[PDB]
């Protein structure tokens, strides 16, 4: 519920995975 | 998936596998909403030109999974499902218009570091999201190329395609409910879904809140990552009130 | 080519 979408292993520790950079970049 | 990559352990923790019980076989893809809903396409579970009508008994879900045939123990949960929801007004008949279907498992889901929900998108995350060239992402276990399977779940990132170039690429009359991702043949790079990720999941990583929300679900595309086609993918804003109605009727 | 997985969830 209001902790959706947040990865236990990434956003909940503050790690990136390879690529979610490539999507940042386009949301131009 | 085509021409994507490897998933990372936990990148995708709302991936859900849809499983047949008889023969024991991939299904489908599907997403992980809430402990005890399950979010896929609507032609995953009913799609009569193929003689495809599953019930409830017929399947089951399987949650947390990475490698695509291995029995997981200790990290994948399997849940039985209770009930299906297909959306009245799913057009298998023409063009998979409003291609959605939700599943009630029998028992919540216990979270953990490889499942976890995906959260629905609201009107003010869609509209800013939603625009050609912005990339979402797609994950699942289906053929790597349209004619092969994969050891792990799959990956690719994909941008959002402008609605005319996605009406001029095909003869398949596109609706509302509808919206197409991939490279145009000039791009350079390639990609898609194809058979067996029907019903995953198109996420997009919200630059506001860094949450990730699904914005689509894989849905159909002719052949799969021909060029000057387009992969599409239902509108999960668009049907969300169809989504919201169905949960808190039976919920 | 699927590993079989436990009986319990075919019960
Ligand atoms: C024309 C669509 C409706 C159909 N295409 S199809 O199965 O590849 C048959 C086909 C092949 C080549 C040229 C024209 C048609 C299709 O995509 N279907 C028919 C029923 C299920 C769904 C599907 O495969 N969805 C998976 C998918 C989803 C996406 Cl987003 C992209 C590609 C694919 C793989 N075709
Ligand atoms: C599919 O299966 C259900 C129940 O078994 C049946 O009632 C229905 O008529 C079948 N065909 C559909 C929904 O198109
Ligand atoms: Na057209
Ligand atoms: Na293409």
Redesign the interface.
């Known amino acids: 519920?209001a902790?959706?979408?947040?990865?236990?292993?990434?956003?909940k520790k503050s790690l990136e995975?390879?690529?979610?950079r490539?999507?940042?970049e386009?949301?131009? | 998936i085509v021409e994507g990559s490897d998933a990372?352990?936990?990148?995708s923790?709302w991936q859900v596998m849809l499983f047949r019980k008889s023969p024991q076989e991939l299904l489908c893809g599907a997403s992980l909403?809430?402990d005890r809903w399950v979010l896929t396409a609507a032609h995953c579970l009913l799609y009569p030109p193929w003689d495809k009508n599953f019930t409830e008994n017929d399947l089951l879900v399987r949650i947390g999974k990475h490698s695509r045939t291995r029995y997981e123990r200790n990290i994948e949960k399997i849940s039985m499902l209770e009930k299906i929801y297909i959306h009245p007004r799913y057009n298998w008949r023409e063009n998979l218009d409003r291609d959605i279907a939700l599943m009630k498992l029998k028992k919540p889901v216990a979270?953990?570091?490889?499942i976890?929900?995906?959260?629905?998108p609201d009107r003010e995350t869609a509209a800013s999201?939603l625009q050609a060239?912005?990339?979402?992402?797609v994950t699942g276990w289906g053929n790597l190329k349209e004619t092969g399977q994969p050891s792990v779940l799959q990956?690719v990132?994909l941008?959002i395609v402008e609605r005319p170039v996605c009406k001029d690429s095909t003869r398949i009359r596109i609706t509302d409910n509808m919206f197409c991702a991939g490279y145009k043949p000039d791009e350079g790079k390639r990609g898609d879904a194809c058979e067996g990720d029907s019903g995953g999941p198109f996420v997009?990583?919200?630059?506001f809140n860094?949450?990730?929300?699904q914005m689509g679900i894989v849905s159909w595309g002719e052949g799969c990552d021909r060029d000057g086609k387009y992969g599409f993918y239902t509108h999960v804003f668009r049907l969300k009130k169809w989504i919201q109605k169905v949960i808190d009727q039976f919920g | 080519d699927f590993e079989e997985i436990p009986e319990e969830y075919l019960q």
């Not at chain 1, 902790?3 to 956003?11: A, M, S, V, Y």
């Not at chain 2, 060239?133 to 992402?137: A, C, E, L, M, T």
């Open positions: 519920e902790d959706c979408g947040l990865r236990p292993l990434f956003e995975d390879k690529t979610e490539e999507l940042l386009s949301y131009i | 990372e352990i936990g990148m923790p909403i809430s979270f953990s570091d490889y976890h929900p995906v959260c629905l999201l060239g912005y990339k979402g992402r990956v990132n941008p997009m990583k919200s630059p860094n949450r990730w929300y």
